[PDB]
Design a protein around this ligand. Structure first.
Ligand SMILES: CC(=O)N[C@H]1[C@H]([C@H](O)[C@H](O)CO)O[C@@](O[C@H]2[C@@H](O)[C@@H](CO)O[C@@H](O[C@H]3[C@H](O)[C@@H](O)[C@H](O)O[C@@H]3CO)[C@@H]2O)(C(=O)O)C[C@@H]1O
Length: 210
C-alpha cells in the first residue's frame, strides 16, 4: 500500500536544473479525521527525526540552507505528487535521496527502496543568442542571450556582451539579457560575445550586417 514511483537515477549539468517526476501512495483510512500530510526529501542515510529536509511541505521543519531555494516540491502533495524540482545544480548535490510521508500518528514511512540518485555533471552547454535575422545596417534590432535548461532558482545570471560592434554604444546597456543596436558596416563580420555568471559560458557570433 506504500508505493513510490520515480526514476532511480538523474543527471544535470552544474549550474543548470532539472525536474524529477515523482508519484507516491500510502494507506489512508480516509474518514473525516483528516490530519495533515507531510512529505520530506532527505539526503541518503539521514534520520527523519533529526535531519533538515532538502525539501519538505512541513512549515516547521528547517530546510538544508544549501538546498533551500534550489530543491522545491512541485505539484500537489495532496495529489500523490512528490515530484522534485532541482535548480542551479551543484557538484555538492550529487548523491542519493529518499522520500518520506507522515500523516497522523499511523502513517509514517520512508521510501527507502526507491532512493533518488542525483548526479551533477560539469556545465558544457553555452548560452544562446536569438533574433529575427534582419542584420541591416542603420536598423536597430534586439538580441536575446539566454542559457538552456536554466532556472531562476539560485542567484540570477549576470550578462555582459563583448565585441568591436559594441563601441558605437554605451558600455552600460551591455549587461541586460536583451540588447538593441543599430548595426554599422564595420560591425558586419564582427565577433560579439555574451558571457554569464551566477552572481565560463560564452557564445561568440559573427555579425552578418547586410
Ligand atoms: C511500515 C510502516 O507503517 N511505517 C514504519 C516505517 C517504515 O517501515 C519505514 O519507513 C520503511 O522504510 O518505519 C518507521 O520506523 C523507522 C524510523 O524510525 C527510521 C528512522 O531512522 O529508522 C528505522 O529503522 C532503521 C534502524 O534504526 C537502523 O539502525 C537501520 O540501519 O535501518 C532501519 C531502517 O531499515 C525505523 O524502522 C518510520 O517511521 O520510518 C516506523 C513506521 O511505523
Amino acid at each position: 500500500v506504500y508505493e513510490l514511483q520515480v526514476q532511480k537515477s538523474v543527471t544535470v549539468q552544474e549550474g543548470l536544473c532539472v525536474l524529477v517526476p515523482c508519484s507516491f501512495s500510502y494507506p489512508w483510512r480516509s474518514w473525516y479525521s483528516s490530519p495533515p500530510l507531510y512529505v520530506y526529501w532527505f539526503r541518503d542515510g539521514e534520520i527523519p527525526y533529526y535531519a533538515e529536509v532538502v525539501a519538505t511541505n512541513n512549515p516547521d521543519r528547517r530546510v538544508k540552507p544549501e538546498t533551500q531555494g534550489r530543491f522545491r516540491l512541485l505539484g500537489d502533495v495532496q495529489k500523490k505528487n512528490c515530484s522534485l524540482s532541482i535548480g542551479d545544480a551543484r557538484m555538492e548535490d550529487t548523491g542519493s535521496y529518499f522520500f518520506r510521508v507522515e500523516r497522523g500518528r499511523d502513517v509514517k514511512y520512508s521510501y527507502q527502496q526507491n532512493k533518488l540518485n542525483l548526479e551533477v555533471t560539469a556545465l558544457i552547454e553555452k548560452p544562446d543568442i536569438h533574433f529575427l535575422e534582419p542584420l541591416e545596417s542603420g536598423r536597430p534590432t534586439r538580441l536575446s542571450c539566454s542559457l538552456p535548461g536554466s532556472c531562476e532558482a539560485g542567484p540570477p545570471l549576470t550578462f555582459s556582451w563583448t565585441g568591436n560592434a559594441l563601441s558605437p554604444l554605451d558600455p552600460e546597456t551591455t549587461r541586460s539579457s536583451e540588447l538593441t543596436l543599430t548595426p554599422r558596416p564595420e560591425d558586419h563580420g564582427t565577433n560579439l560575445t555574451c558571457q554569464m555568471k551566477r552572481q565560463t559560458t560564452e557564445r561568440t557570433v559573427q555579425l552578418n550586417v547586410s
